[PDB]
Design a protein around this ligand. Structure first.
Ligand SMILES: C[C@@H]1Nc2nc(N)[nH]c(=O)c2N2CN(c3ccc(C[C@H](O)[C@H](O)[C@H](O)CO[C@H]4O[C@H](COP(=O)(O)O[C@@H](CCC(=O)O)C(=O)O)[C@@H](O)[C@H]4O)cc3)[C@H](C)[C@@H]12
Ligand SMILES: C[C@@H]1Nc2nc(N)[nH]c(=O)c2N2CN(c3ccc(C[C@H](O)[C@H](O)[C@H](O)CO[C@H]4O[C@H](COP(=O)(O)O[C@@H](CCC(=O)O)C(=O)O)[C@@H](O)[C@H]4O)cc3)[C@H](C)[C@@H]12
Ligand SMILES: C[C@H](OP(=O)(O)OC[C@@H](O)[C@@H](O)[C@@H](O)Cn1c2nc(=O)[nH]c(=O)c-2cc2ccc(O)cc21)C(=O)N[C@@H](CCC(=O)N[C@@H](CCC(=O)O)C(=O)O)C(=O)O
Ligand SMILES: C[C@H](OP(=O)(O)OC[C@@H](O)[C@@H](O)[C@@H](O)Cn1c2nc(=O)[nH]c(=O)c-2cc2ccc(O)cc21)C(=O)N[C@@H](CCC(=O)N[C@@H](CCC(=O)O)C(=O)O)C(=O)O
Ligand SMILES: C[C@H](OP(=O)(O)OC[C@@H](O)[C@@H](O)[C@@H](O)Cn1c2nc(=O)[nH]c(=O)c-2cc2ccc(O)cc21)C(=O)N[C@@H](CCC(=O)N[C@@H](CCC(=O)O)C(=O)O)C(=O)O
Ligand SMILES: C[C@H](OP(=O)(O)OC[C@@H](O)[C@@H](O)[C@@H](O)Cn1c2nc(=O)[nH]c(=O)c-2cc2ccc(O)cc21)C(=O)N[C@@H](CCC(=O)N[C@@H](CCC(=O)O)C(=O)O)C(=O)O
Ligand SMILES: [Ca+2]
Ligand SMILES: [Ca+2]
Ligand SMILES: [Ca+2]
Ligand SMILES: [Ca+2]
Ligand code: NA
Ligand code: NA
Ligand code: NA
Lengths: 282, 282, 282, 282, 282, 282
C-alpha cells in the first residue's frame, strides 16, 4: 500500500521546515508519497485559511491518510483557524508547533488533533534593525543543527513513521495520533547516545535553545526602546549559535567512539538501524 | 500593487528550501503574496508533473506574476519536464538549480526561462549506509550556514527583489528574468564584506562547498564498492562542515569590526541597508 | 581615610569568593584594610552564627566601617540568621547573594541592610554522583570567567568603591548602602564594551549563567531518580562551560580592537581607567 | 569524631583560594568543621601577624587538630613570620605555597611544619598598567581550571584527607604532616587519567603554568621599562589562558571514553571513587 | 649493509622538503647515508642542470644506490631536464612531484624513472601582493600538517623504505622503482586510522588540499586583474589552513582512542610499528 | 650584482629548514643565486666535515659571497668542526643554531663568524617509542607555524637581506656579519604587529616554544625510565602544538584589523612592505 499525507506550512519553525524530508531522506521510499502546500512565512488568519483550503482542495484527489499542519504558535489567531478547519475535516490531523502551543494542548485533544510541540524550536529575534534575510537563515542553520544533532529530529521521524505504518493497515484512529511534547528531558528516555557526555551536552543545547525563546520574546514584544531591544534579540542569536556548537560537540563525541546512531529507511519503508560506520543498516 | 508568486519545490536544495523566506524575513511585507507547493523530495517526472499541475491549478485563481521552480539538477528527467511545462505556460518562470543545471543553461534560455544556478549548493552523500534523516539535516544546517554567511542568499534575494519590483509595473519580459550563475568568484563583484579576510574566508568556503558535489557524485554514482563509497560520501559531509566553519569565521571577523552588512526589507518592500549594529536601516 | 571592613563568607558563590580581592587587586591600596572570616562551605544556622560571632569578636578591636556578609541564598535559614544579627549590630552591613535572595529583598530593605544580588551566580549541580571537588573547582573556574569577562565583577567593584569613599568621609547612612540586582540587562546601562557584538555575547553568557540555576535546582531538589538527576545536573555544568566560552569570545573581540576596559586602583584608592593597551590608566 | 582545622589565608594563590572547599564539596561531611581567617590580599609581616593572632585566638576555644597557612611565597617576610609563629605553637601546622617556597623547604622541615608546594600555582602579572580586578579574576579563572582539570587539586585533597584521618585517630605526629612538592611530573606517579594523551596534555598544561611564573617575575621585578614590562606581564596571562585550554582538552578526552575520575566524599568523610558517568561512587 | 642516496631539491614542495628526514627521524639509522644538494627555490633549466651536475659530480665518489629528484611539476622545462639527465645516468632514479606531473607519467615510465606524485601537495598562491616569506612558510606549515597527520608521508616513508631494503641487496632494477600517485583515495587501501571518522576527516583534508592547487593556478596563471587575483590566491591559503585543521582533528580522534599509529625505524633500519602509547614498537 | 651564497644543512632545525627559502619566496629574484648541500639529519663530525667539503669544493667554481651553516647546536662536536673549517676558510660565514649555541657564542666571535641563534627553535622529543616520521613532521609543522606567524622568520629574513646588500657593495667584512640571539623579547624591539594583543600572544607562543627545549632535554638526556620519558617527550609536543595555536590566533587578530604585515621581495632584491590587504607593496 502507498501511504499518503499532506503537509501544510504557514510561518516558519525549524521542525516544520524539515518534517516531510525526515521521512524519505533519499527519496527512495516506495511506500509513501507527499504533497506539501503553504503560504510561506505568512500565518495571519486570511493566509492560513487560504492554505488549509488549498490542502483540503488537494485532499479531494490525493486522498491522504493524514494531514499535518506545521508552524509557529498553535495558539495564535491564524493557527487557531487551521485547527478548527482541520478539526472539522474527516482527515486525521497533526499539529506541529513550538512552546506557545502548550496553551492549547488541552483544546487540541478536545478537537481530536494530534500534536508535537517542540520547546527548543524557539522564536528568533524578529526586529527590523537586526533580522534581515541572511541573519534569519543563519539562525535557522544553527537551530537545524541543534534539532538534528541532539536527536530531536529522530523523535519526530519516529512519531510519523509509527503513524504511517498504522495507515498501511488503513485505520488511523485518534488513539493513534501523536501527542508529544519535546524538550531537554526527552533525551532521558531515548537511547540516542552511547556516550553519556554527548547526551548531557545535547541536553544542554536543548536547554539553551528553549531559553532563547524567552529572550526573543522580551526583545520583540516587551522591550520598546531600540537601544535595549536590538541588543536583546541579538543576544538570543548568540545563544543559539552556542547551542549549535554544543550539539556539534556531542556528535563529535559519538564519532570518537564510532557510535553515531543512523536510522535510515529501506525502500519498503522499514526503519533500519546501525551504530558502527561500516556496518550495514538492518 | 502586490506582486504575487508561486514557488514549486521538488527534491531539495539549500537554496530552494529558503528561497521564499529570504524575501519576507519578518512576514511584514505588504507588497508580496506567495503560495508554495511541492512533492517533497520526489522529483521523478510523474511527481514533478503533478507538482507543476498543482501550481497551474492554483494559478487560475491566484494570478501569479511569476512562478519559481526550485530543485536539484534542471537537466534531470523530472526538472526537464517542469521546464517544458513552465516554458509552455502563460506565466514567466525562473529555475533555481545547482551546478548540473549548466548542462542545460542554453536550453533554458532557448526556452525563455530565467534561472539561478548555485554551484556551491552541493548534492549530499546519498547512500543508505550513511545518510539517515539526521545526517541529511546536519548537512543541510552546514550548507545553509555557508550560503547565508558567505552572502549567496543575499545574491538570490536581490535578484528576486529586482524581479518583484518589475512585476509591479506589470510587464516581466523574458528580458526581466534573472539568468545567474553563482560561485566563489561572485563575491569578487560584490561589496558584501568590509574586511578582506572575511571575504577570502567566504570565498574559500564556497570553493569547498562546490568541491563537495564532485565527491558526492563519485561516491553515489561512480564507485560501486561500499567499502569505498561509504567513506567517500562521509568525507564529503566533513568538507561541508568545515566550509560552514569558515563561513562562521568570516562573519565573526565582520562582527569584530562592527561591520556586519544587513539588508532588511521595509514593509513597502524597499531594501534597506545598514552596517553598524546600532545604526537604523535606511 | 583608611577604610576598614570585615568580610564573612559562609558557603560559596563566585562573587563571594572574589569580592574582597576585587577591591585591592595588587595589594597596593593604602586606603583599605580588610579582615576575612568564615566557616568555609558550611552555611547551616549554627555555622553562620559562629562566623558572625567571629566577625563581631574581632570587630571590637578592629573597628570596621562596614561588614559584608557573602554567600548563597540570603533567604535560607543560615543567612537569615546572619541578616538578623548584622541588622541589630551597630555596623553598616551589605549582603552579597544570588537570585534566591530576591525573595527577601524587601525584608533586607526593612532590616536596614545593603545588598548586591547576582543572578548569574548560579548554584552548581550538587549531587554526590557527579560533584566531587574537581568538578566543583572546574565549575567555579567557568563561573568566575563569566562574572569577570562580562563585567559583572566591575559592577561589584564599583558599588564597593563608592561605599568605601562614603566610609572614609565618615557617614555611611542607610541611604548610602548598595541596593543592586545584577543580571543580563545590567549590561544595557553600562559602557563596558566598545564592540557591540562583544556586549551581546556577554549578555548571552549572563543569560545562560542565570538559566544554569533552574537546571541545578531541578536536579538537586526536584527530580528524585538518579537516572534522571545525574544527567540533569551535568547538563547545567556543560551550559556554564559554554557561557564561559562566550565570555572569552567577547573579551577576544575587545582585544581585537585594542579596547579592553581596565579600571585599576591607584595607591590612594582612586579608580583609574584606560582602554588602549599602551595607554596609562588615568 | 569530628576533625577540626583552621585555615589562614594571606595574599592569594589558586591553591589557597580553594583548599578548604576541596575537602567538603557538597557541605555534607559530618566529620569535619573548619574556620577560615585572613587579611585578604595583604601579606606584609604586620598583616600576617594579625591573621595568625586571629587564628590563635580562635584556636583557644575551637581547639583545632591542625592549622593551615596558605598563600604566596613561604620565603617572603610576612609568610616567614607566619612560619615562626605556627612552628613555635602547640598546633601541627601545614604551609601551602608556590615555587619560591622551595628556598625554605629545608627550613620548614627543621621547623617541624608540613608543606605543600605547588609549582604551577604561578604569580600573575601585577603591574598597574595591565592588572585590574577583572584581569586578576580572569587569571584566577584560568589557573583554577588548570589546577582542577589536571588533577593537582586532587593531589592536595588527598594529602589533607590523609591528615584528617590521622587527626580523628589522635596522633598528629610530625611524621604525618604532608611534605609535597607538586609539578608536571607529579602526574607520572598517579592514575588520574585513563587516556595517555589526556595525561600528556595535562603535563603540558602544568609545565606552561609553571613557566608563567618566570615571565611574571621578569615583568614585575626585573624589567623596569614600561614599554617592555607591560607586554611581558600580558604575555604571561596569554600563556595561562592556553594552559587552561590544554587542561580542558585533557578533560574532554576523558569524557570521550566515559572515564572521568570523580572522588567525592561520603558523609563520614570516606573518599569514594568512580569513572563511569552513570555509576555510583564507591 | 648501508643504502646510499642523493636527494636533489629544486623549487619547493611539502614532500620534497621532508622526504629525506622522513627516512631517519632520529638520526640513528646505521643502514643509510644521504647527501642532499639543490639550488633552493630556483627550478629553471639552467639551475636544475647545475643541481643535477653537483649531484652527479658527488655521485662519482659517493656511489649512490639511487637518486631522488624532488620538486614542483615534473612536466615543466627545468624538471624535464632533470628527468632526462637522471634517466640517461647509470643511477636508478625517482621523481617526487605534484599533480601536474601526471601529464608526463607515461614519459617517466618510458624513461625508466620511478615517481611518487602527490596530488595534495598543492602549489601556493605565488603573487607578490600576497606571498611574502612569512606567508610562504605559514602555507608550508599547514601543508606539512596535512601531509603528515593524514598519513601521506607514511606512504612515502614506506615506498622509500622498500627501495632502501632492496638497495641493501645492490640490484635496483627499474621494476623495483616506485610508481605511485597519491590522493584522497589512497587512504581507502591503507590501515592508517583505527577510527573511521578520523579516516574520513583525513580524506576530506586531502580533498581540500588537492583543490587548493586549482585555486592557485587560477589566481597565478589565469586571472590577470589584481583586484581579483589577490583575493583568489589568499582564498587558497584559507582552504589549506582548514585542511590542516581537519587533519589535526583526525589525529586528535586517534589520541582519544589511544590508537595513534607510529612506525619508527630501528637502528638496523627495520620499520617497527605500534598503536598504544605506552607499548614498545615491534 | 648577483650575490651568491652556499647553505650547508646538517641536522634539522625550523630555521635551517627554511632559511634559504625566506630569501626568494617567489623565486623571481634576479639578484641572488644559492647552492644548498648537506648530509640530511646526520651531524656527527664525519658527516659535517663531508658536508663542508662538498660546500668548499662547489665554492671553488661557484665563488659564493658568503656561506651559511645551519643546524642543531653549534656547541656539539660536528658543528664545532664546521665552525673551525668555515672560520679557517676564505669565506665570510654565518652559523644558524638554537639556544645551546649560546655556550660557544664567545668562541664564535673569536672565530670571526656571524651567528643567528634562535631560542624558540627547540629540540623535539627524540625517543624511539614516541618519535616516528609522521610525529617528527607534525612537530616541524607546529614549529614552523610558530616561527613564521610570530615573526621570527622575518627577523631572520632581514638579517640575511642586510648581508646580501653588503655583498652587493662587495665587502662583507666581519662587522657586517649578524650576531643575533632571538627570543620572546626580540618582539619588543620590532614593529611586527599592529595590534598589541597579537604581539603578546606571539610572545607567549615564543615563550612556550622556548620552554619546550627544556622538556625535550629532560626526556631525552636526563630521564632514564621509559615509563617516564615517553610521557615527558610527548608532553613537549603537546606544548608545541599549543604554541602553534597561539601564533595562529595572533595572526587572525591582525587579519581582523586588515593589518597583516607583508615584506615581499621585488625582482631586483629590494625588500618591500605593506599592511593593507589590497595595497601594493612598496
Ligand atoms: C521568517 C522567520 N523565520 C523563522 N524561522 C524560525 N526557525 N523561527 C522563527 O521564529 C522565524 N521567524 C519568526 N518570525 C517573526 C516572529 C515575530 C514577529 C513579530 C515582531 O517581532 C513584532 O511585530 C516586532 O518585534 C515589531 O518590530 C517592528 O517594530 C520595530 C520598530 O519599527 P518602526 O521604525 O516601524 O517603529 C522594528 O523592529 C520592526 O521590525 C515577526 C516575525 C519570522 C516571520 C520568521
Ligand atoms: C629529524 C629530527 N628533526 C628535527 N626537527 C626539528 N625542527 N628539531 C629537532 O630537534 C629535530 N630532531 C632532533 N633530532 C634528535 C635530537 C636528539 C636526539 C638524541 C636522543 O634523544 C637520545 O640519544 C636518546 O637517548 C635516544 O633514546 C634511545 O633510547 C631509548 C632506548 O632504546 P634502546 O633500548 O634501543 O637503547 C629509545 O627511545 C631510543 O630512541 C636524537 C635525534 C632529530 C634527528 C631531528
Ligand atoms: O503574544 P503572542 O501571540 O503569544 O505572541 C506573538 C507571536 O507568537 C506571533 O506573532 C507569532 O506569529 C510570531 N511567529 C511568527 N510570526 C509570523 O508571522 N511568521 C513566522 O514565521 C513566525 C515565526 C515564529 C516562530 C515561533 C513563534 O513562537 C512565533 C512565530
Ligand atoms: O544520472 P543523472 O540524471 O545525471 O542524475 C544525477 C543526479 O543529479 C540526479 O540523480 C538527481 O535527482 C539527484 N538528486 C536528487 N534526487 C532526488 O531524488 N531527490 C533529491 O532531492 C535530489 C537531491 C539532489 C540535490 C542535488 C543534485 O545535484 C542532485 C540531487
Ligand atoms: O530549602 P531552601 O531554603 O529553599 O534551600 C536549601 C538550601 O540548602 C540551599 O538553597 C542552599 O543551602 C544550597 N547552597 C549551598 N549549601 C551549602 O550548604 N553550602 C553552599 O556553599 C551552597 C552553595 C549554594 C549556592 C547557591 C545557592 O542558591 C545555594 C547554595
Ligand atoms: O624576594 P622574593 O621572595 O622573590 O620576593 C617575594 C615576592 O614573592 C613578593 O613580592 C610577594 O609578596 C608577591 N606576591 C604577592 N604579594 C602580595 O602582596 N599579595 C599577594 O597576593 C601576592 C601574590 C603572589 C603570588 C605568588 C607569588 O609567588 C608571590 C605573590
Ligand atoms: Ca499531466
Ligand atoms: Ca607607551
Ligand atoms: Ca660516507
Ligand atoms: Ca637522453
Ligand atoms: Na519581512
Ligand atoms: Na573609621
Ligand atoms: Na621559565
Amino acid at each position: 500500500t502507498v501511504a499518503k499525507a499532506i503537509f501544510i506550512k504557514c510561518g516558519n519553525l525549524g521542525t516544520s521546515m524539515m518534517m516531510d524530508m525526515l521521512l524519505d531522506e533519499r527519496a527512495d521510499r516506495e511506500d509513501v508519497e507527499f504533497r506539501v502546500v503553504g503560504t510561506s512565512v505568512k500565518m495571519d488568519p486570511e493566509c492560513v485559511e487560504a492554505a488549509v483550503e488549498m490542502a483540503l482542495d488537494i485532499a479531494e484527489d490525493f486522498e491522504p491518510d493524514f494531514i499535518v499542519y506545521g508552524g509557529p504558535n498553535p495558539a495564535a489567531p491564524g493557527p487557531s483557524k487551521a485547527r478548527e478547519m482541520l478539526a472539522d475535516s474527516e482527515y486525521p490531523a497533526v499539529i506541529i508547533g513550538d512552546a506557545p502551543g502548550l496553551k492549547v494542548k488541552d483544546e487540541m485533544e478536545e478537537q481530536g488533533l494530534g500534536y508535537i510541540l517542540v520547546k527548543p524550536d524557539a522564536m528568533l529575534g524578529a526586529r527590523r534593525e537586526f533580522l534581515d534575510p541572511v541573519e534569519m537563515a543563519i539562525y535557522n542553520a544553527d537551530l537545524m543543527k541543534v534539532l538534528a544533532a541532539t536527536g530531536v529530529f529522530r523523535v519526530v521521524q519516529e512519531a510519523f513513521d509509527e503513524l504511517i505504518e498504522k495507515a498501511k493497515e488503513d485505520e488511523i484512529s485518534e488513539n493513534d495520533l501523536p501527542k508529544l511534547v519535546i524538550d531537554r528531558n526527552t533525551l532521558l528516555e531515548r537511547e540516542e547516545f552511547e556516550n553519556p557526555y554527548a547526551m548531557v551536552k545535547a541536553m544542554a543545547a536543548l536547554e539553551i535553545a528553549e531559553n532563547v525563546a524567552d529572550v526573543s520574546v522580551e526583545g520583540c514584544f516587551v522591550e520598546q526602546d531600540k537601544e535595549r531591544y536590538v541588543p536583546i534579540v541579538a543576544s538570543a542569536h548568540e545563544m543559539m549559535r552556542k547551542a549549535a556548537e554544543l550539539a556539534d560537540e556531542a556528535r563529535e563525541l559519538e564519532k570518537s567512539n564510532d557510535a553515531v546512531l543512523r536510522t535510515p529507511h529501506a525502500p519498503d519503508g522499514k526503519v533500519l538501524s546501525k551504530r558502527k560506520f561500516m556496518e550495514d543498516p538492518e
